[PDB]
């Protein structure tokens with residue numbers, strides 16, 4: 001549990017990642033709790049977190065794309 | 081997180097079904113004569129959890145069924161039931177039932193009775209902090225010598241892999257493949273917002289004409305769409321912000337990199353002594369770096385050190401054992417499996433280990449086998465393996481009876 005544990009699950013097991021989980025996540029404030037960590041971290045665990053961040057980043061992107069498509073085809077929809 | 085219970089059927093020498101009485105969360109020791117089913121039991125668990133067993137040529141797979149007397153054994157399974165009371169596994173259950181079943185064609189994992197992929201189970205275990213970059217969650221006599229009789233060069237390659245270097249280079253490279261796949265989405269996004277922005281522009285003008293004098297829906301909805309485009313914008317800004325602070329991560333990692341590798345190195349060294357100085361009291365030992373090219377060992381059992389090759393029999397083994405124990409302190413795990421590790425050392429040291437496990441097992445679970453009574457002192461539950469008409473049986477025994485089968 002904690003701030004980064006949401007990123008941990010992202011890089012090993014994104015089953016526990018809701019849409020709202022992805023949305024809720026502040027990537028910037030997370031790479032910050034990676035770069036200045038509570039206790040300097042093994043090069044292994046840094047590499048994992050790195051992936052998790054990019055996972056969430058990717059899903060955010062995926063969702064936004066989905067939504068911009070729906071929104072656009074909603075518009076020319078309403079032209080007739 | 082610990083192994084609450086193990087259940088085996090049809091695996092190597094355990095032909096009939098075996099519901100092994102639930103483990104202590106501390107140290108459970110397993111005794112039995114040679115060729116009664118000890119190593120076979122650890123294999124059943126390595127079968128469910130170890131990386132080296134995830135990929136099995138079918139010849140390898142069939143090796144694991146039970147060839148014996150009765151009807152032709154046709155499938156095996158090993159269900160490991162973890163206690164998850166500290167939610168270390170990312171599953172909202174207090175127990176988790178991992179089980180692998182096996183057959184001529186089938187090789188299938190089940191997670192709380194639901195099919196999962198080997199790659200799932202790998203991810204699941206990695207997530208609980210079981211790194212495949214770490215070969216020492218299970219320790220056999222094999223891996224003690226492989227360590228003891230190892231070149232200082234290969235001993236480097238080991239630590240680099242444990243420290244990170246491989247998993248880092250592997251994720252680091254894995255991440256970029258994502259981000260370049262993302263760009264195509266990001267641009268496909270930015271495009272849409274421009275297309276949408278034009279239809280808003282268009283509506284603006286049609287909605288001006290009619291006011292100053294193309295379905296009514298669009299006109300009706302024009303406010304909502306406008307509101308909606310600024311909703312998406314703020315999300316797009318989140319990405320363009322986020323993208324920046326990932327590059328700022330990737331660089332800090334390529335720089336704290338070597339600091340972090342040697343960060344790891346120093347810590348194992350530090351643990352190396354502490355463990356050895358504790359097992360052999362009055363002794364002292366440290367690690368050393370050659371040319372970077374390799375990592376060697378210099379040990380003093382009282383300071384008149386000697387190289388790794390320049391050591392004895394049950395001395396090379398014990399030294400290499402400490403090295404492992406140190407690597408463990410420097411990346412611990414909820415439980416460990418030890419298949420006869422005390423064998424190669426004399427009873428004065430045999431106790432010195434057993435003594436250390438007493439301390440260790442207040443904070444992790446150990447499942448271990450032995451022939452020597454030293455580590456029976458270190459145990460909390462006692463299992464007897466018994467071969468009998470070509471098939472093994474496991475049973476809870478009392479520590480009195482345990483000093484029997486030794």
Ligand SMILES: Nc1ncnc2c1ncn2[C@@H]1O[C@H](COP(=O)(O)OP(=O)(O)O)[C@@H](O)[C@H]1O
Nearest residue numbers: 092093114115116117118119120143145146147
């Ligand atoms: N695939 C198998 N099917 C049935 N029996 C096996 C199989 N493989 C090994 N065995 C036998 O079961 C016994 C192995 O028990 P094992 O754990 O390896 O020895 P130990 O009890 O000393 O640790 C040996 O008789 C061994 O040859």
Ligand SMILES: [Mg+2]
Nearest residue numbers: 115118119120
């Ligand atoms: Mg054996």
